Amino acid sequence: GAEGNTLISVDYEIFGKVQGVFFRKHTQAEGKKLGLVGWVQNTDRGTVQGQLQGPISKVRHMQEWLETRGSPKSHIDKANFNNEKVILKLDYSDFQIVK
């Protein structure tokens, strides 16, 4: 087991060539690696908002993975997170893709 998994909450946002791409399909796979919950979708403007929820032990790595790694058709012109804080625990059951 572990000492303590301080569950935290935080969102993300990517800009560039992450609009007309089906990269979201891959997000469902990589999301299982670390083991987190949330969803995937796009906005009316032209960006992808992925609300990731999990322990700092997994989020700390996810932040330095989605901003760097990624398909060749997903240029990350700008990557930044928001709404970073600690909470009781996750509010979902698993990850899923939303079209």
Side-chain angles (χ1 to χ4, degrees):
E3 289 182 286
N5 306 289
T6 310
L7 212 298
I8 52 150
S9 156
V10 67
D11 59 67
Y12 286 80
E13 185 172 55
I14 309 298
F15 188 65
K17 201 75 211 173
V18 294
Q19 277 182 243
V21 67
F22 53 86
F23 172 48
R24 70 184 84 74
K25 207 271 206 87
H26 272 52
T27 305
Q28 177 182 251
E30 57 197 13
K32 197 182 86 273
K33 290 273 279 185
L34 275 297
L36 282 81
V37 298
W39 72 82
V40 186
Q41 60 158 40
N42 57 280
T43 62
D44 273 292
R45 300 291 85 170
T47 44
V48 179
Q49 294 186 352
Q51 206 163 288
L52 182 60
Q53 211 104 129
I56 189 157
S57 178
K58 272 79 200 85
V59 179
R60 181 71 162 177
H61 275 22
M62 271 282 199
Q63 57 177 64
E64 293 270 318
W65 191 298
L66 284 179
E67 74 185 10
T68 53
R69 313 303 299 171
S71 29
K73 300 185 174 202
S74 62
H75 207 279
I76 305 173
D77 200 63
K78 183 77 77 169
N80 188 235
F81 58 79
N82 203 248
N83 206 244
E84 181 174 275
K85 45 178 276 281
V86 304
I87 35 59
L88 303 180
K89 50 176 194 72
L90 307 150
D91 59 281
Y92 274 91
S93 277
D94 210 89
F95 57 78
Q96 53 154 42
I97 303 166
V98 184
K99 211 282 94 211

Coordinates of all heavy atoms in Angstrom, one line a residue:
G1 N 0.8 -1.2 0.0 CA 0.0 0.0 0.0 C 0.8 1.3 0.0 O 2.1 1.2 -0.2
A2 N 0.2 2.4 0.2 CA 0.9 3.7 0.2 C 0.6 4.4 1.5 O -0.3 4.1 2.3 CB 0.5 4.5 -1.0
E3 N 1.4 5.5 1.7 CA 1.2 6.3 2.9 C 0.0 7.1 2.9 O -0.8 7.1 3.8 CB 2.5 7.2 3.1 CG 3.7 6.4 3.5 CD 4.9 7.3 3.8 OE1 5.5 7.9 2.8 OE2 5.3 7.6 4.9
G4 N -0.2 7.9 1.8 CA -1.3 8.7 1.6 C -1.4 9.3 0.3 O -0.5 10.0 -0.2
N5 N -2.5 9.1 -0.4 CA -2.7 9.7 -1.8 C -3.6 10.9 -1.7 O -4.8 10.8 -1.9 CB -3.3 8.6 -2.7 CG -2.5 7.4 -2.7 OD1 -1.4 7.3 -3.3 ND2 -3.1 6.3 -2.1
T6 N -3.0 12.1 -1.5 CA -3.8 13.3 -1.4 C -4.4 13.6 -2.7 O -3.8 14.2 -3.6 CB -2.9 14.5 -1.0 OG1 -2.1 14.1 0.2 CG2 -3.7 15.7 -0.7
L7 N -5.7 13.3 -2.9 CA -6.4 13.5 -4.1 C -6.6 15.0 -4.4 O -6.9 15.8 -3.5 CB -7.8 12.9 -4.0 CG -8.4 12.4 -5.3 CD1 -8.6 13.5 -6.3 CD2 -7.5 11.3 -5.9
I8 N -6.3 15.4 -5.6 CA -6.4 16.8 -6.0 C -7.2 17.0 -7.3 O -7.4 16.0 -8.0 CB -5.0 17.4 -6.2 CG1 -4.1 16.6 -7.2 CG2 -4.3 17.6 -4.9 CD1 -3.1 17.3 -8.0
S9 N -7.6 18.2 -7.5 CA -8.4 18.5 -8.7 C -7.8 19.6 -9.5 O -7.2 20.6 -9.0 CB -9.8 18.9 -8.3 OG -10.4 19.7 -9.4
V10 N -7.8 19.5 -10.9 CA -7.2 20.5 -11.8 C -7.6 20.3 -13.2 O -7.9 19.1 -13.6 CB -5.7 20.5 -11.7 CG1 -5.1 19.2 -12.3 CG2 -5.1 21.7 -12.4
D11 N -7.7 21.3 -14.0 CA -8.1 21.3 -15.4 C -7.0 21.5 -16.3 O -5.8 21.8 -15.8 CB -9.3 22.3 -15.6 CG -8.9 23.7 -15.4 OD1 -8.0 24.2 -16.1 OD2 -9.4 24.3 -14.4
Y12 N -7.2 21.5 -17.6 CA -6.2 21.7 -18.6 C -6.7 22.4 -19.8 O -7.9 22.6 -19.9 CB -5.5 20.4 -19.0 CG -4.6 19.8 -17.9 CD1 -5.1 19.1 -16.9 CD2 -3.2 19.9 -18.0 CE1 -4.3 18.5 -15.9 CE2 -2.4 19.4 -17.1 CZ -2.9 18.7 -16.0 OH -2.1 18.2 -15.1
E13 N -5.8 22.8 -20.7 CA -6.2 23.5 -21.9 C -5.1 23.5 -23.0 O -4.0 23.9 -22.6 CB -6.7 24.9 -21.6 CG -7.2 25.7 -22.8 CD -7.8 27.0 -22.4 OE1 -7.1 27.8 -21.8 OE2 -9.0 27.3 -22.8
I14 N -5.4 23.1 -24.2 CA -4.4 23.0 -25.2 C -4.8 23.9 -26.4 O -6.0 24.0 -26.7 CB -4.2 21.6 -25.7 CG1 -3.9 20.7 -24.5 CG2 -3.0 21.6 -26.7 CD1 -2.6 21.0 -23.8
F15 N -3.9 24.5 -27.1 CA -4.1 25.3 -28.3 C -3.2 25.0 -29.4 O -2.0 24.7 -29.2 CB -4.0 26.8 -27.9 CG -4.5 27.8 -28.9 CD1 -5.8 27.8 -29.3 CD2 -3.6 28.6 -29.6 CE1 -6.2 28.6 -30.3 CE2 -4.0 29.5 -30.5 CZ -5.3 29.5 -30.9
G16 N -3.7 25.1 -30.6 CA -2.9 24.8 -31.8 C -3.6 23.9 -32.8 O -4.6 24.3 -33.4
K17 N -3.1 22.7 -33.0 CA -3.6 21.8 -33.9 C -4.5 20.7 -33.2 O -4.6 19.6 -33.7 CB -2.6 21.1 -34.8 CG -3.1 20.5 -36.1 CD -3.4 21.6 -37.1 CE -4.5 21.2 -38.0 NZ -4.9 22.3 -39.0
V18 N -5.0 21.1 -32.0 CA -5.8 20.2 -31.2 C -7.2 20.4 -31.4 O -8.0 20.2 -30.5 CB -5.4 20.3 -29.7 CG1 -4.0 19.8 -29.5 CG2 -5.6 21.7 -29.3
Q19 N -7.6 20.9 -32.6 CA -9.0 21.1 -32.9 C -9.6 20.1 -33.9 O -10.4 19.2 -33.5 CB -9.1 22.5 -33.6 CG -9.2 23.6 -32.6 CD -9.4 25.0 -33.2 OE1 -8.5 25.9 -33.1 NE2 -10.5 25.2 -33.9
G20 N -9.1 20.1 -35.1 CA -9.6 19.1 -36.1 C -8.8 17.8 -36.1 O -8.3 17.4 -37.1
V21 N -8.7 17.2 -34.9 CA -8.0 16.0 -34.7 C -8.8 15.0 -33.8 O -9.5 15.5 -32.9 CB -6.6 16.2 -34.2 CG1 -6.6 16.8 -32.7 CG2 -5.8 14.9 -34.2
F22 N -8.6 13.7 -33.9 CA -9.2 12.7 -33.1 C -8.3 12.3 -32.0 O -8.4 11.1 -31.5 CB -9.7 11.5 -33.9 CG -8.6 11.0 -34.8 CD1 -7.7 10.0 -34.3 CD2 -8.4 11.4 -36.1 CE1 -6.7 9.5 -35.0 CE2 -7.4 10.8 -36.9 CZ -6.6 9.9 -36.4
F23 N -7.4 13.2 -31.6 CA -6.4 12.8 -30.5 C -7.2 12.4 -29.2 O -6.6 11.7 -28.4 CB -5.5 14.0 -30.2 CG -4.6 13.8 -29.0 CD1 -3.9 12.7 -28.9 CD2 -4.5 14.8 -28.1 CE1 -3.1 12.5 -27.8 CE2 -3.7 14.7 -27.0 CZ -3.0 13.5 -26.8
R24 N -8.4 12.9 -29.1 CA -9.2 12.6 -27.9 C -9.3 11.1 -27.7 O -9.3 10.6 -26.6 CB -10.6 13.2 -28.0 CG -11.4 12.5 -29.1 CD -12.8 13.2 -29.2 NE -12.7 14.3 -30.2 CZ -12.6 14.2 -31.5 NH1 -12.6 13.0 -32.0 NH2 -12.6 15.3 -32.2
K25 N -9.3 10.3 -28.8 CA -9.3 8.9 -28.7 C -8.1 8.3 -28.0 O -8.2 7.3 -27.3 CB -9.4 8.3 -30.1 CG -10.1 6.9 -30.2 CD -9.1 5.8 -30.0 CE -9.6 4.5 -30.7 NZ -9.2 4.4 -32.1
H26 N -7.0 8.9 -28.2 CA -5.7 8.5 -27.5 C -5.7 8.9 -26.1 O -5.1 8.2 -25.2 CB -4.5 9.0 -28.3 CG -4.0 8.2 -29.4 ND1 -4.9 7.7 -30.4 CD2 -2.8 7.7 -29.7 CE1 -4.1 7.0 -31.3 NE2 -2.9 7.0 -30.8
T27 N -6.4 10.0 -25.8 CA -6.5 10.5 -24.4 C -7.1 9.4 -23.5 O -6.8 9.4 -22.3 CB -7.2 11.8 -24.3 OG1 -6.7 12.8 -25.2 CG2 -7.2 12.3 -22.9
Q28 N -8.0 8.6 -24.0 CA -8.7 7.6 -23.3 C -7.7 6.4 -22.9 O -7.9 5.8 -21.9 CB -9.9 7.0 -24.0 CG -10.6 5.9 -23.3 CD -11.8 5.4 -24.1 OE1 -12.9 5.6 -23.8 NE2 -11.4 4.7 -25.2
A29 N -6.7 6.2 -23.7 CA -5.7 5.2 -23.5 C -4.7 5.6 -22.4 O -4.5 5.0 -21.4 CB -5.0 4.8 -24.8
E30 N -4.0 6.7 -22.7 CA -3.0 7.3 -21.8 C -3.6 7.6 -20.4 O -2.9 7.5 -19.4 CB -2.4 8.5 -22.4 CG -3.4 9.6 -22.7 CD -2.8 10.7 -23.6 OE1 -1.8 10.4 -24.2 OE2 -3.4 11.7 -23.7
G31 N -4.9 7.8 -20.4 CA -5.6 8.2 -19.2 C -5.7 6.9 -18.3 O -5.9 7.1 -17.0
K32 N -5.6 5.8 -18.8 CA -5.7 4.5 -18.1 C -4.4 4.1 -17.5 O -4.3 3.5 -16.4 CB -6.2 3.4 -19.0 CG -6.7 2.2 -18.2 CD -7.2 1.1 -19.2 CE -6.0 0.2 -19.6 NZ -5.3 0.7 -20.7
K33 N -3.3 4.5 -18.1 CA -1.9 4.2 -17.7 C -1.8 4.7 -16.2 O -1.5 3.8 -15.3 CB -0.9 5.0 -18.5 CG -0.8 4.4 -19.9 CD 0.2 3.2 -20.0 CE 1.6 3.7 -20.1 NZ 2.6 2.6 -20.3
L34 N -1.9 6.0 -16.0 CA -1.7 6.5 -14.6 C -2.9 6.0 -13.7 O -2.7 5.7 -12.6 CB -1.7 8.0 -14.6 CG -0.3 8.6 -14.9 CD1 0.7 8.2 -13.7 CD2 0.3 8.1 -16.2
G35 N -4.1 6.0 -14.3 CA -5.3 5.6 -13.6 C -6.0 6.8 -12.9 O -5.9 7.0 -11.7
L36 N -6.7 7.6 -13.8 CA -7.5 8.7 -13.3 C -8.9 8.7 -13.8 O -9.3 7.9 -14.6 CB -6.7 10.0 -13.7 CG -5.5 10.4 -12.8 CD1 -4.3 9.6 -13.2 CD2 -5.2 11.9 -12.9
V37 N -9.7 9.8 -13.5 CA -11.0 9.9 -13.9 C -11.3 11.3 -14.6 O -10.4 12.2 -14.5 CB -12.0 9.7 -12.8 CG1 -11.9 8.3 -12.2 CG2 -11.8 10.8 -11.7
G38 N -12.4 11.4 -15.3 CA -12.7 12.6 -16.0 C -13.4 12.4 -17.3 O -14.2 11.5 -17.4
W39 N -13.2 13.3 -18.2 CA -13.8 13.2 -19.5 C -13.0 14.0 -20.6 O -12.0 14.7 -20.3 CB -15.2 13.8 -19.5 CG -15.3 15.2 -19.3 CD1 -15.2 16.2 -20.3 CD2 -15.5 16.0 -18.1 NE1 -15.3 17.4 -19.8 CE2 -15.5 17.4 -18.5 CE3 -15.7 15.6 -16.8 CZ2 -15.7 18.4 -17.5 CZ3 -15.8 16.6 -15.9 CH2 -15.8 18.0 -16.2
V40 N -13.5 13.9 -21.8 CA -12.8 14.6 -22.9 C -13.8 15.2 -23.9 O -14.7 14.5 -24.3 CB -11.8 13.7 -23.7 CG1 -11.0 14.4 -24.7 CG2 -10.9 13.0 -22.7
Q41 N -13.6 16.5 -24.3 CA -14.5 17.1 -25.2 C -13.8 18.4 -25.8 O -12.7 18.8 -25.4 CB -15.8 17.5 -24.5 CG -15.6 18.4 -23.3 CD -16.9 19.1 -23.0 OE1 -18.0 18.6 -23.1 NE2 -16.8 20.4 -22.6
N42 N -14.5 19.1 -26.7 CA -14.0 20.3 -27.3 C -15.0 21.5 -27.0 O -16.1 21.3 -26.6 CB -13.8 20.1 -28.8 CG -15.1 19.7 -29.5 OD1 -15.5 18.5 -29.5 ND2 -15.8 20.6 -30.1
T43 N -14.5 22.7 -27.3 CA -15.3 23.9 -27.1 C -15.8 24.4 -28.4 O -15.4 23.9 -29.5 CB -14.5 25.0 -26.3 OG1 -13.4 25.4 -27.1 CG2 -14.1 24.5 -25.0
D44 N -16.6 25.5 -28.4 CA -17.2 26.1 -29.6 C -16.1 27.0 -30.2 O -16.2 27.2 -31.4 CB -18.4 26.9 -29.2 CG -19.7 26.0 -29.3 OD1 -20.1 25.6 -30.4 OD2 -20.3 25.8 -28.2
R45 N -15.2 27.5 -29.4 CA -14.2 28.4 -29.9 C -13.2 27.6 -30.7 O -13.1 27.8 -31.9 CB -13.5 29.1 -28.7 CG -14.4 29.9 -27.8 CD -14.9 31.2 -28.6 NE -16.0 30.9 -29.4 CZ -16.8 31.9 -30.0 NH1 -16.4 33.1 -29.8 NH2 -17.8 31.5 -30.7
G46 N -12.4 26.8 -30.1 CA -11.4 26.0 -30.8 C -10.3 25.5 -29.9 O -9.1 25.6 -30.2
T47 N -10.7 24.9 -28.8 CA -9.8 24.3 -27.8 C -10.3 23.0 -27.2 O -11.5 22.7 -27.4 CB -9.4 25.3 -26.7 OG1 -10.6 25.9 -26.2 CG2 -8.5 26.4 -27.2
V48 N -9.5 22.3 -26.5 CA -9.9 21.1 -25.8 C -9.7 21.2 -24.3 O -8.6 21.3 -23.8 CB -9.0 19.9 -26.3 CG1 -9.4 18.6 -25.7 CG2 -9.2 19.8 -27.9
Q49 N -10.8 21.1 -23.6 CA -10.8 21.2 -22.1 C -10.9 19.8 -21.5 O -12.0 19.2 -21.6 CB -11.9 22.1 -21.7 CG -11.8 23.5 -22.0 CD -12.8 24.4 -21.4 OE1 -13.8 24.0 -20.8 NE2 -12.6 25.7 -21.6
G50 N -9.9 19.3 -20.9 CA -9.9 18.0 -20.3 C -9.8 18.0 -18.8 O -8.7 18.3 -18.3
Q51 N -10.9 17.9 -18.1 CA -10.9 17.9 -16.7 C -10.3 16.6 -16.1 O -11.0 15.6 -16.0 CB -12.3 18.1 -16.1 CG -12.3 18.8 -14.8 CD -13.7 19.4 -14.4 OE1 -14.0 20.4 -15.0 NE2 -14.4 18.8 -13.5
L52 N -9.1 16.6 -15.7 CA -8.4 15.5 -15.1 C -8.5 15.5 -13.6 O -8.2 16.5 -12.9 CB -6.9 15.4 -15.5 CG -6.2 14.2 -15.0 CD1 -6.8 12.9 -15.5 CD2 -4.7 14.3 -15.5
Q53 N -8.9 14.4 -13.0 CA -9.0 14.3 -11.5 C -8.2 13.0 -11.0 O -8.5 11.9 -11.4 CB -10.4 14.2 -11.1 CG -10.7 14.8 -9.7 CD -11.4 16.2 -9.8 OE1 -12.4 16.5 -9.2 NE2 -10.8 17.1 -10.7
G54 N -7.3 13.2 -10.1 CA -6.5 12.1 -9.5 C -5.6 12.6 -8.4 O -5.5 13.8 -8.1
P55 N -4.8 11.7 -7.9 CA -3.8 11.9 -6.8 C -2.6 12.7 -7.4 O -2.2 12.6 -8.5 CB -3.4 10.6 -6.4 CG -3.6 9.7 -7.5 CD -4.8 10.2 -8.2
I56 N -2.0 13.6 -6.5 CA -0.9 14.4 -6.9 C 0.2 13.5 -7.4 O 1.1 14.0 -8.2 CB -0.4 15.2 -5.7 CG1 0.7 16.2 -6.2 CG2 0.2 14.3 -4.6 CD1 0.8 17.4 -5.3
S57 N 0.3 12.3 -7.0 CA 1.3 11.3 -7.4 C 1.2 11.0 -8.9 O 2.1 10.6 -9.6 CB 1.2 10.0 -6.6 OG 2.2 9.1 -7.0
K58 N -0.1 11.1 -9.4 CA -0.4 10.8 -10.8 C -0.5 12.1 -11.6 O -0.2 12.1 -12.8 CB -1.6 10.0 -10.9 CG -1.4 8.5 -10.8 CD -1.2 8.0 -9.4 CE -0.4 6.7 -9.3 NZ 1.0 6.8 -9.4
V59 N -1.0 13.1 -11.0 CA -1.3 14.4 -11.6 C 0.1 15.1 -11.9 O 0.3 15.8 -12.9 CB -2.1 15.3 -10.8 CG1 -2.3 16.7 -11.4 CG2 -3.5 14.7 -10.5
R60 N 1.0 15.0 -10.9 CA 2.3 15.6 -11.1 C 3.0 15.1 -12.3 O 3.9 15.8 -12.9 CB 3.2 15.3 -9.8 CG 4.5 16.0 -9.9 CD 4.5 17.5 -9.7 NE 5.7 18.1 -9.3 CZ 6.0 19.4 -9.2 NH1 5.0 20.2 -9.4 NH2 7.2 19.8 -8.9
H61 N 2.7 13.9 -12.7 CA 3.4 13.2 -13.9 C 2.5 13.5 -15.1 O 3.1 13.7 -16.2 CB 3.5 11.7 -13.6 CG 4.8 11.4 -12.9 ND1 5.4 12.2 -12.1 CD2 5.5 10.2 -12.9 CE1 6.5 11.6 -11.6 NE2 6.5 10.4 -12.0
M62 N 1.2 13.6 -14.9 CA 0.3 13.8 -16.1 C 0.5 15.2 -16.6 O 0.4 15.4 -17.8 CB -1.1 13.6 -15.6 CG -1.7 12.2 -15.8 SD -2.1 11.8 -17.5 CE -3.1 10.4 -17.2
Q63 N 0.8 16.2 -15.8 CA 1.0 17.5 -16.2 C 2.3 17.6 -17.0 O 2.4 18.4 -18.0 CB 1.2 18.4 -15.0 CG 2.3 18.0 -14.0 CD 2.4 19.0 -12.8 OE1 1.5 19.1 -12.0 NE2 3.5 19.7 -12.7
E64 N 3.3 16.9 -16.7 CA 4.6 16.9 -17.4 C 4.6 15.7 -18.5 O 5.7 15.2 -18.8 CB 5.8 16.7 -16.5 CG 5.9 17.9 -15.6 CD 6.9 19.0 -16.1 OE1 7.9 18.6 -16.7 OE2 6.5 20.2 -16.0
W65 N 3.4 15.3 -18.9 CA 3.3 14.3 -19.9 C 2.4 14.7 -21.1 O 2.8 14.4 -22.2 CB 2.8 13.0 -19.3 CG 2.9 11.8 -20.1 CD1 2.4 11.6 -21.4 CD2 3.7 10.6 -19.9 NE1 2.7 10.4 -21.9 CE2 3.5 9.7 -21.0 CE3 4.5 10.2 -18.8 CZ2 4.1 8.5 -21.0 CZ3 5.1 9.0 -18.9 CH2 4.9 8.1 -20.0
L66 N 1.3 15.3 -20.8 CA 0.4 15.8 -21.8 C 0.9 17.0 -22.5 O 0.5 17.3 -23.6 CB -1.0 16.0 -21.1 CG -1.8 14.8 -20.8 CD1 -3.1 15.2 -20.2 CD2 -2.0 13.9 -22.1
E67 N 1.7 17.8 -21.7 CA 2.2 19.1 -22.3 C 3.4 18.8 -23.2 O 3.7 19.5 -24.1 CB 2.7 20.0 -21.2 CG 4.0 19.5 -20.5 CD 4.3 20.4 -19.3 OE1 3.5 21.2 -18.9 OE2 5.4 20.2 -18.7
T68 N 4.1 17.7 -23.0 CA 5.2 17.3 -23.8 C 4.9 16.2 -24.8 O 4.9 16.5 -26.0 CB 6.4 16.7 -22.9 OG1 5.9 15.7 -22.1 CG2 7.0 17.8 -22.1
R69 N 4.5 15.0 -24.3 CA 4.1 13.9 -25.2 C 2.8 14.3 -26.0 O 2.1 15.3 -25.6 CB 3.9 12.7 -24.4 CG 5.0 12.4 -23.4 CD 6.4 12.3 -24.2 NE 6.4 11.2 -25.2 CZ 7.4 11.1 -26.0 NH1 8.4 11.9 -26.1 NH2 7.3 10.1 -26.9
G70 N 2.4 13.4 -26.9 CA 1.2 13.7 -27.7 C 1.4 13.3 -29.2 O 2.5 13.4 -29.7
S71 N 0.3 13.0 -29.8 CA 0.3 12.7 -31.3 C 1.0 13.8 -32.1 O 1.1 14.9 -31.6 CB -1.1 12.4 -31.8 OG -2.0 13.2 -31.0
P72 N 1.4 13.5 -33.3 CA 2.1 14.4 -34.2 C 1.1 15.4 -34.7 O 1.5 16.5 -35.2 CB 2.6 13.5 -35.3 CG 1.7 12.3 -35.3 CD 1.4 12.1 -33.9
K73 N -0.2 15.1 -34.7 CA -1.2 16.0 -35.1 C -1.9 16.8 -34.0 O -3.1 17.1 -34.1 CB -2.3 15.2 -35.9 CG -1.7 14.5 -37.1 CD -2.8 13.8 -37.9 CE -2.3 13.2 -39.2 NZ -3.3 13.1 -40.3
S74 N -1.1 17.0 -32.9 CA -1.6 17.7 -31.8 C -0.6 18.7 -31.2 O -0.2 18.6 -30.1 CB -2.0 16.7 -30.7 OG -0.9 16.0 -30.2
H75 N -0.3 19.7 -32.1 CA 0.7 20.7 -31.7 C 0.2 21.5 -30.5 O -0.9 22.1 -30.4 CB 0.9 21.7 -32.9 CG 2.2 22.4 -32.8 ND1 2.6 23.4 -32.0 CD2 3.4 22.1 -33.5 CE1 3.8 23.8 -32.3 NE2 4.3 23.0 -33.2
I76 N 1.0 21.5 -29.4 CA 0.7 22.1 -28.2 C 1.3 23.5 -28.1 O 2.3 23.8 -27.4 CB 1.2 21.3 -26.9 CG1 0.7 19.9 -27.0 CG2 0.8 22.0 -25.7 CD1 1.2 19.0 -25.9
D77 N 0.7 24.5 -28.9 CA 1.2 25.8 -28.9 C 1.3 26.4 -27.5 O 2.1 27.3 -27.2 CB 0.3 26.7 -29.8 CG 1.0 27.9 -30.3 OD1 2.0 27.8 -31.0 OD2 0.5 29.0 -30.0
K78 N 0.3 26.0 -26.7 CA 0.2 26.5 -25.3 C -0.5 25.5 -24.4 O -1.6 25.1 -24.7 CB -0.5 27.9 -25.3 CG -0.6 28.5 -23.9 CD 0.8 29.2 -23.5 CE 1.0 30.5 -24.2 NZ 2.1 31.2 -23.7
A79 N 0.2 25.2 -23.3 CA -0.4 24.2 -22.4 C -0.3 24.7 -21.0 O 0.8 25.1 -20.5 CB 0.3 22.9 -22.5
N80 N -1.4 24.8 -20.3 CA -1.5 25.3 -18.9 C -2.6 24.8 -18.2 O -3.7 24.4 -18.8 CB -1.5 26.9 -18.9 CG -1.4 27.4 -17.5 OD1 -2.2 28.2 -17.1 ND2 -0.3 27.1 -16.8
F81 N -2.5 24.6 -16.9 CA -3.5 24.0 -16.0 C -4.2 25.1 -15.2 O -3.6 26.2 -15.0 CB -3.0 22.9 -15.1 CG -1.9 23.4 -14.2 CD1 -2.1 24.1 -13.1 CD2 -0.6 23.1 -14.6 CE1 -1.1 24.5 -12.3 CE2 0.5 23.5 -13.8 CZ 0.2 24.2 -12.6
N82 N -5.3 24.8 -14.6 CA -6.0 25.8 -13.7 C -6.9 25.1 -12.7 O -7.2 23.9 -12.9 CB -6.9 26.7 -14.6 CG -7.2 28.0 -13.9 OD1 -8.3 28.3 -13.5 ND2 -6.2 28.8 -13.7
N83 N -7.4 25.8 -11.7 CA -8.2 25.2 -10.7 C -7.5 24.1 -9.9 O -8.1 23.0 -9.7 CB -9.5 24.7 -11.3 CG -10.7 24.6 -10.3 OD1 -11.2 23.6 -10.0 ND2 -11.1 25.8 -9.9
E84 N -6.3 24.4 -9.5 CA -5.5 23.4 -8.8 C -5.7 23.5 -7.3 O -5.5 24.6 -6.7 CB -4.0 23.6 -9.1 CG -3.1 22.6 -8.4 CD -1.7 22.7 -8.8 OE1 -1.3 22.1 -9.8 OE2 -0.9 23.4 -8.1
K85 N -6.2 22.5 -6.6 CA -6.5 22.5 -5.2 C -6.8 21.0 -4.7 O -7.1 20.1 -5.5 CB -7.7 23.4 -4.9 CG -8.9 23.2 -5.8 CD -10.0 24.1 -5.5 CE -10.9 23.5 -4.4 NZ -11.8 22.4 -4.9
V86 N -6.8 20.9 -3.4 CA -7.0 19.6 -2.8 C -8.5 19.4 -2.4 O -9.1 20.4 -2.0 CB -6.1 19.3 -1.6 CG1 -4.7 19.5 -2.0 CG2 -6.5 20.3 -0.5
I87 N -9.0 18.2 -2.5 CA -10.4 18.0 -2.1 C -10.5 16.6 -1.4 O -9.6 15.8 -1.3 CB -11.3 18.0 -3.3 CG1 -10.6 17.4 -4.5 CG2 -11.8 19.4 -3.6 CD1 -10.1 16.0 -4.4
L88 N -11.7 16.3 -0.9 CA -12.0 15.0 -0.2 C -11.6 13.9 -1.1 O -10.8 13.0 -0.6 CB -13.5 14.9 0.1 CG -14.1 16.0 0.9 CD1 -15.6 15.8 1.1 CD2 -13.4 16.2 2.2
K89 N -12.0 13.8 -2.3 CA -11.7 12.7 -3.3 C -12.3 13.0 -4.6 O -13.0 14.0 -4.9 CB -12.1 11.4 -2.7 CG -13.6 11.4 -2.2 CD -14.0 10.0 -1.8 CE -15.5 9.8 -1.7 NZ -16.1 9.8 -3.0
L90 N -12.1 12.0 -5.5 CA -12.6 12.1 -6.9 C -14.1 12.1 -6.9 O -14.7 11.8 -5.9 CB -12.1 10.9 -7.7 CG -10.6 10.7 -7.8 CD1 -10.3 9.2 -7.9 CD2 -10.0 11.5 -8.9
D91 N -14.7 12.6 -8.0 CA -16.2 12.7 -8.1 C -16.7 11.9 -9.3 O -17.7 12.3 -9.8 CB -16.6 14.2 -8.1 CG -16.0 14.9 -9.3 OD1 -14.8 15.3 -9.3 OD2 -16.7 15.0 -10.4
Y92 N -15.9 10.9 -9.7 CA -16.3 10.1 -10.8 C -16.0 8.6 -10.6 O -15.5 8.3 -9.5 CB -15.5 10.6 -12.1 CG -16.2 11.7 -12.8 CD1 -15.9 13.0 -12.5 CD2 -17.2 11.5 -13.8 CE1 -16.6 14.1 -13.2 CE2 -17.8 12.5 -14.5 CZ -17.5 13.8 -14.1 OH -18.1 14.8 -14.8
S93 N -16.3 7.8 -11.6 CA -16.1 6.4 -11.5 C -14.9 5.9 -12.4 O -14.2 5.0 -12.1 CB -17.4 5.6 -11.8 OG -18.2 5.5 -10.7
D94 N -14.8 6.6 -13.5 CA -13.8 6.2 -14.5 C -13.7 7.3 -15.6 O -14.5 8.2 -15.6 CB -14.1 4.9 -15.1 CG -12.8 4.2 -15.5 OD1 -12.2 3.5 -14.7 OD2 -12.3 4.3 -16.7
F95 N -12.8 7.1 -16.5 CA -12.6 8.1 -17.6 C -13.5 7.7 -18.8 O -14.0 6.5 -18.9 CB -11.2 8.1 -18.1 CG -10.6 6.7 -18.5 CD1 -10.9 6.2 -19.7 CD2 -9.8 6.0 -17.6 CE1 -10.5 5.0 -20.1 CE2 -9.3 4.8 -18.0 CZ -9.6 4.3 -19.2
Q96 N -13.8 8.6 -19.7 CA -14.6 8.4 -20.8 C -14.5 9.5 -21.9 O -14.0 10.6 -21.5 CB -16.1 8.3 -20.4 CG -16.6 9.4 -19.6 CD -18.1 9.7 -19.7 OE1 -18.9 8.7 -19.7 NE2 -18.5 10.9 -19.8
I97 N -14.8 9.2 -23.1 CA -14.7 10.2 -24.2 C -16.1 10.8 -24.5 O -17.1 10.1 -24.6 CB -14.2 9.6 -25.5 CG1 -12.8 9.0 -25.2 CG2 -14.1 10.7 -26.6 CD1 -12.3 8.1 -26.3
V98 N -16.1 12.2 -24.6 CA -17.4 12.9 -24.9 C -17.3 13.6 -26.2 O -16.4 14.5 -26.4 CB -17.8 13.8 -23.8 CG1 -19.1 14.5 -24.1 CG2 -17.8 13.1 -22.4
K99 N -18.2 13.3 -27.2 CA -18.2 14.0 -28.5 C -19.2 15.1 -28.5 O -20.4 14.9 -28.4 CB -18.5 13.0 -29.6 CG -17.8 13.3 -30.9 CD -18.5 14.4 -31.6 CE -17.9 15.8 -31.3 NZ -19.0 16.8 -31.4

